[PDB]
Design a protein around this ligand. Structure first.
Ligand SMILES: O=C(O)[C@H]1CNC[C@@H](O)[C@@H]1O
Ligand SMILES: O=C(O)[C@H]1CNC[C@@H](O)[C@@H]1O
Lengths: 620, 620
């Protein structure tokens, strides 16, 4: 269950396998299994990590349906592998993958946004090894994220009553039809690496939690005392583990030796005097160094953490006991050539833009992001809402046990991967599932989501709040959103309804805000926005102009400022991003306040000035 | 002198150091050297590889002048450094760097586009090591590429006669002023890695050459016999090295054991029957495996190569004895967030676009590119003209001994790094230096460049042709260009002169072609083009419209098709790219046939149709 990111130290080495691999497309429902036995025939080049779809302009890989096959060779010195446990880790293979090493099937994985690994100790050999990875991009009614089995993609146009249309659909080329508003970029989107641990006994998982803060300073920079807890899990086979806590300068400020008891675990607590707390806008990180003891060290792992508490109290959201206000947006992992491929240059740039904007937070819409982005937000003081890929869901999925199992898998996998990040303050278990309606539909949705809400709470040792991001709906028949810890709403008054009429949009919004006022929960936007083409201007801005987007946020934000229980504004979106093609997507989704190349539209400048004047704590 | 790219095998391991480093800006002329003794204070994140300039929008790092400081920590198992020679390699630090490891100054380097390395066997230690790299971006009258010490950047506007301007210049913030038309992106632009070799005796360099081809097939796919030569250099301290030649399937087709003799070298020839030849559009690669013998193997290195000859004969350019015609463009290493940083997703996409366009070649304008791109072009059958960063030069530089030494270093360093690539067919020793004029100026330029032409020929074991890329000039007083092995001219008739008037442009072009007809050398364009804003259209296209760009190539190409001695058309540019800001640069240089996001303008479609109909061999 532990998925610690691979580390190099005196006991462990990581051998990256990124670079230019060989690649072939394969069939809609099959690939040649014999490709794992010999070098691929007539291979294309394909860089890893990256989506494959935009890496070849001779082929139309955005249209590909089904399997592709990656392959490369590697060699490592016998000295590296001797006596060690060898693990091959895939940070992400989107959506499903079959992995072969020297012709041997290691195993398979479903779930395109979370890491998986194999023990390859016995499958490796000396000299060149041949690694073959088949990757399946298909989505449909039983995948997360959800695809449509027929009809159109999300907000696609149709003329379904025309007989010629009905007939042509029967013979059309198969294509994935996302039931979500982003392009189905596929492939080895994140890093691949071989790593080593000791074989006899090794550190398998670490959890650090902030248990209690005593006498927190008025500015929240420190606490007189912080009680933290550790939980180390071991693999392999009167043994001990040394746990050292290092402050920001590398100084060992605390140390304890713990007994390993058997499933091997060491557990306990440490009090840290005058602890420096992690806050939005003012990050501070410690390192917990776990050293497996026999003079010597047997194994070691260095786990970053930050000391801070998160608590929902009434209509407030308390970080280190202070009332926080979210400023930010949903994001995407999306960029020109990379697709959904991880790109740390762009992550570094995006975190700087978050600071330029004076925002303090974002949501990982609509899937867990690459691990490096959370490390970045840890060091940069940016709060994250962490979301599983359960987008596109409705009653057809809730009745499908395979979907429920995939949903539980995603929630457990996300929290197991991400639990140690101080920047994560809240979990999102779905984006815009169907919740409202009549008859038994609202109750069926509730019975589907309530156990998953409980699952997210049971899985997180820090016990952070749990939400479900709600689509614009009939809020009076939805019975599920109002039971979340924070109510997170996506609303497009004046864009998808009351179009262009900001007076009516604000009137409608206030009617719904009156509803939420009586519910008594803290409420925030997680989406609201307007497609905007940079360079479209007007003196009285209409839909798609830069002025309309600016006016949209100016009007809507004036209304939520009047509500003391409205605790955040995350807009849609940070930046324009790719989608399946359709009549409402102009080269993708254009609700970014930045362009796809991260340049600011008029609204971004306005929001920057607004957010410069809103404190992280005490605004409401 | 050897710079073999780091390889992992049974005798050697590579440990990458890329990732998110710590970073601080420093002074115009200094940085704090004590930063190498402890973690940088209050660091920013900075992804490596990548330019730093576009990775932080809070700061204005495009405006930065002087030093910045990078830092990271790393740790490797003692088990794998033990007994080994430990080398730290910087694939590129732009432009100059000081490198510290655990406080100790390892040394410094100046060229910004070529790799350098340090032996750190003795500076490493167990546990965490602290690597600090100060990088200097400054350019001026003594650097390659050349900066201006005062005035404006390349093609900048001025009103120098206005007294207020003259006075304001004296106090203006110091800024790099490129004397070249691309942005001065700086930082750790390419990968950083630590690698190991055996310490007592190791392979230091390998050079493979195609010495002779017997009975080449009519289609140039094979020769009845190919004679290749090897030259292996060793470091360290009756010794022997086994050379195995592997074909595309890994079959050992030829092999020899050579004696090692004292600088420790082994060299010889190998006959390969029915050799499969490397051609544009039809790549074929062999591998030369060199194994240092003591049954055991002491050391090994696998060197890719391709079997082909390059020869200029009269007014033809012969590859494997067939008359080649260049179709392609100058490129840049330039992209949105990365800057000049290497990006293998983008390299893979760009090579696919070269194929989409039916081009067969490019030039590395105006600096050597990342090593991975040449490996890609070797495998994809794309021909390269390899160019050093000697851009922006004029008579001020020719009398500067520091410049001359940097120019010789770049020529030797480029050819030492790149000599084994079959895709490289020609070396370029400068782009658009000053060559014409009256008095002694033409002779001064000739006396500067002729020793460099000879140096390039003496450095390359394959003895490939050498050129210098000529700016639009008075070709009748230039005495240097006409002495190159291939005449490579940059011409902008109808753009920078005779503007908009394609009839006059073609007339002027034909007058100059008449001059070159009498010189009797093979001639090619290395640049010609027209800035073009995608989406600007006209029925009679004017400058900056998509139609003008199409008409420009249509008219110019019709004229060179009439000249049998004109052996190639490389246009400017493959794609729009960033420049220093100025009144003639609309968000950079817009002469790309693709946009900066690699989308095709009208002219790219027209060129694709033209080039589809032009064969690699025998067009003229
Ligand atoms: O319609 C939109 O722009 C948004 C609506 N809410 C869900 C988002 O993924 C989607 O992109
Ligand atoms: O002016 C231009 O567009 C080009 C002229 N020749 C040199 C190129 O670097 C430059 O970009």
């Amino acid at each position: 269950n532990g998925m610690l990111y691979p580390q190099s130290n005196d006991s462990r080495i990581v051998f990256p396998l990124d670079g230019v691999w060989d690649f072939r497309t394969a069939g809609e429902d099959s690939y040649p299994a014999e490709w794992a036995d010999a070098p691929l025939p007539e291979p294309l080049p394909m860089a890893v990590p990256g989506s494959y779809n935009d890496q070849n302009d001779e082929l139309n890989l955005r249209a590909h349906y089904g399997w592709v096959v990656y392959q490369r060779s590697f060699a490592v010195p016998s000295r590296l592998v001797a006596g060690q446990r060898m693990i091959l880790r895939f940070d992400a293979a989107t959506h499903a993958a079959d992995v072969y090493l020297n012709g041997q099937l290691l195993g398979s994985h479903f779930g395109g946004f979370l890491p998986f690994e194999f023990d390859v100790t016995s499958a490796l050999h000396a000299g060149e090894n041949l690694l073959t990875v088949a990757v399946d991009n298909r989505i449909g009614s039983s995948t997360l994220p959800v695809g449509n089995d027929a009809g159109t993609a999300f907000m696609g146009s149709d003329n379904a009553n025309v007989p010629a249309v009905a007939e042509a659909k029967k013979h059309a080329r198969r294509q994935n039809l996302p039931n979500f508003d982003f392009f189905n970029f596929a492939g080895l989107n994140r890093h691949v690496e071989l790593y080593t641990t000791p074989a006899d006994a090794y550190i398998a998982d670490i959890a650090i939690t902030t248990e209690r803060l005593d006498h927190i300073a008025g500015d929240a920079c420190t606490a007189a005392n912080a009680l933290i807890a550790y939980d180390v899990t071991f693999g392999g086979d009167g043994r001990q583990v040394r746990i050292s806590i290092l402050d920001g300068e590398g100084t060992v400020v605390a140390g304890v030796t713990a007994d390993i008891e058997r499933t091997a675990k060491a557990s306990g607590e440490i009090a840290i005097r005058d602890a420096k707390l992690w806050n939005p806008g003012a990050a501070y990180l410690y390192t917990a160094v776990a050293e497996l003891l026999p003079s010597r060290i047997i194994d070691a792992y260095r786990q970053t953490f930050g000391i801070r508490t998160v608590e929902v109290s009434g209509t407030t959201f308390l970080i280190n006991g202070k009332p926080f206000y979210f400023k930010g947006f949903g994001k995407h992992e999306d960029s020109y050539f990379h697709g959904r491929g991880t790109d740390d240059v762009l992550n570094v740039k995006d975190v700087s833009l978050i600071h330029w904007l004076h925002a303090n937070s974002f949501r990982t819409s609509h899937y867990p992001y690459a691990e490096s982005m959370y490390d970045l937000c840890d060091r940069e003081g940016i709060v994250i809402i962490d979301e599983v890929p359960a987008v596109g869901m409705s009653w057809l999925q809730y009745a499908n046990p395979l979907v429920a199992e995939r949903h539980r898998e995603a929630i457990r996998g996300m929290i197991a991967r991400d639990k140690n990040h101080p920047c994560i303050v809240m979990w999102s278990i779905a984006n815009e599932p169907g919740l409202d309606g009549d008859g038994e539909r609202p109750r069926q949705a509730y019975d589907y989501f309530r156990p998953l809400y409980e699952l997210a709470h049971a899985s997180d040792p820090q016990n952070r709040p749990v939400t479900l991001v709600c689509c614009q709906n009939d809020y009076t028949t939805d019975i599920t959103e109002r039971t979340m810890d924070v109510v997170c709403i996506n609303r497009y008054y004046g864009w998808y309804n009351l179009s262009g009429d900001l007076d009516a949009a604000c009137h409608a919004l206030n009617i719904e805000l009156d509803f939420w006022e009586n519910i008594g929960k803290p409420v925030m936007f997680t989406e609201y926005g307007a497609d905007t083409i940079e360079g479209i201007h007007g003196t009285h801005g209409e839909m798609f102009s830069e002025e309309f987007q600016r006016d949209y946020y100016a009007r809507i934000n004036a209304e939520i400022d009047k509500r003391p229980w409205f605790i955040g504004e995350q807009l849609w979106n940070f930046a324009d991003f790719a989608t399946f093609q359709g009549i409402i997507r102009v080269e993708g989704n254009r609700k970014g306040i930045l362009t796809r190349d991260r340049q600011p539209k008029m609204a971004a400048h306005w929001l920057r000035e607004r957010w410069a004047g809103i404190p992280d704590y005490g605004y409401k």
